[PDB]
Structure formats: structure tokens, C-alpha cells
Amino acid sequence: MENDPNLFVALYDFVASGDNTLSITKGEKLRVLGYNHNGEWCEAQTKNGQGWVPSNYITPVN
């Protein structure tokens, strides 16, 4: 069976700008799928859906 994913937490609010970005709120948990070519955008999952968020608006959490 596949292991539970490790998670991240949102550091700051980010309002989606369209274009497959995802709004996130400080304190939400996220699962990270990956990053774009320069690492500046992060494709993540939250309770609100899936999409791109700024990579430095999130961080690992135990």
C-alpha cells in the first residue's frame, strides 16, 4: 500500500489569479505534487482543490 503523503503548511494567503492557480490561506495543509521549470510555482492540493501556488508561500510541516 502507498504511504500517507508528508504535508506542507501555507505561510501566507494567496488569492488565485486564474490560470490554474489555487487560492490558499495561512495555516491550511497542502500536499505537494511538484514544481514548474524554475521552481517558483508549486502544484499543490488542499481541501479546496488543486492548482499552482507560489513555492515560497508554503513550507514543510511535521
Partner: peptide, 10 residues
């Protein structure tokens, strides 16, 4: 992912 850069940390 967007072709424009994300906003800087606030």
C-alpha cells in the same frame, strides 16, 4: 504553471 512569476512573499 503560469508563465508569469508569482507574487513575492508579503
Amino acid at each position: 504553471a503560469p508563465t508569469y512569476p508569482p507574487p513575492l512573499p508579503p
